[PDB]
């Protein structure tokens, strides 16, 4: 409620994109950030026809973002709950999602901007930025459960940040989350133990991270292309995993290998990932990362 904002301080400009059960708009917000008259933001909404299970999820994402303050995690700006429709105001990621951005870089891409594919260096930056964001999440005792390029966002300056907390869960009590009933899951990004037992941990998120790296080095190619969900389930549950994309830097190939260890305790931690890349990063990284923060004690 300390996050409540007058629906009058909000103005929708255009539509940014359609969400599974809502629409995301770009707009302006008057005095949402002390020191700023108007701030360009993104605004999430729910369609009237949205089910309560979806409304709860929508309200969950907002809820959990309230406790986050990380440069590599899309930031929550405010909420409008007084009278419908409900509005979730967050920072605007000028370059949209990473998947979509990666595909733009395909040479054949009709929307190709004007540059070549990411550089080994540019990739390391993305990777560290993503891993840093996840480390914070883990540190706050939350498991993302849906890490993927489509859920990674790109800032105006190309800084990548973690977004979409619909499936995120608090695991302060046990260090893991166990889903027993049926539900929509991002199987191609899921670890073996998750597919088999429905258990999610920082470790299963790390598996997803490996998949994102693959997404990056393959320019958002569809993972397990060819196989059907059921086939992927079996393939992965039986020890399988993605191939290295074309010309994939072996350094990155190393990370993917660490990420896809069959035994979750064999996989690295996000802090470890950052630690492995801390040297070859943009000079500003230490000024913004969670890694180099006082919080990381």
């Amino acid at each position: 409620d300390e996050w409540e904002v007058s629906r009058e301080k909000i103005t929708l400009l255009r539509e940014l994109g359609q969400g599974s059960f809502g629409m995301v708009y770009e707009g302006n917000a008057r005095d949402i950030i002390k020191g700023e008259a108007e701030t360009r933001v993104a605004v999430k909404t729910v369609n009237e026809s949205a089910s309560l299970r979806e409304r709860i999820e929508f309200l969950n994402e907002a809820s959990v973002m309230k406790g986050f303050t990380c440069h590599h995690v899309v930031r929550l700006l405010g909420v409008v709950s007084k009278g419908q429709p409900t509005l979730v105001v967050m920072e605007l990621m000028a370059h949209g999602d990473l998947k979509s951005y990666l595909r733009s870089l395909r040479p054949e891409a009709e929307n190709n901007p004007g540059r070549p594919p990411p550089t080994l260096q540019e990739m390391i930056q993305m990777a560290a930025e993503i891993a840093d964001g996840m480390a914070y999440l883990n540190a706050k005792k939350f498991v993302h459960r849906d890490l993927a390029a489509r859920n990674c966002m790109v800032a105006h300056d190309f800084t990548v940040k973690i977004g979409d907390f619909g499936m995120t869960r608090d695991i302060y009590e046990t260090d893991y989350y166990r889903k027993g009933g049926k539900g929509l899951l991002p199987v191609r990004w899921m670890a073996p133990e998750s597919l088999k037992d429905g258990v999610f941990t920082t470790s299963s998120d790390m598996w997803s991270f490996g998949v994102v790296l693959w997404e990056i080095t393959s320019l958002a190619e569809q993972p397990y292309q060819g196989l059907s969900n059921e086939q992927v389930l079996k393939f992965v549950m039986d020890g399988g995993y993605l191939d290295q994309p074309d010309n994939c830097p072996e350094r990155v190939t190393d990370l993917m290998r660490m990420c896809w260890q069959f035994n979750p305790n064999m996989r690295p931690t996000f802090l470890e990932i950052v630690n492995l890349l801390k040297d070859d990063l943009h000079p500003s990284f230490p000024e913004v990362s969670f890694f180099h923060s006082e919080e990381n004690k």
């Binding site: 994109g17 359609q18 049926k182 899951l185 991002p186 199987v187 088999k196 037992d197 969900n229 389930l233």
Partner: peptide, 13 residues
């Protein structure tokens, strides 16, 4: 536009 095909309705095996 949303990658709805990335999700499969399921329960653990």
């Amino acid at each position: 536009l949303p990658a709805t095909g990335d999700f499969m309705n399921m329960s653990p095996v």
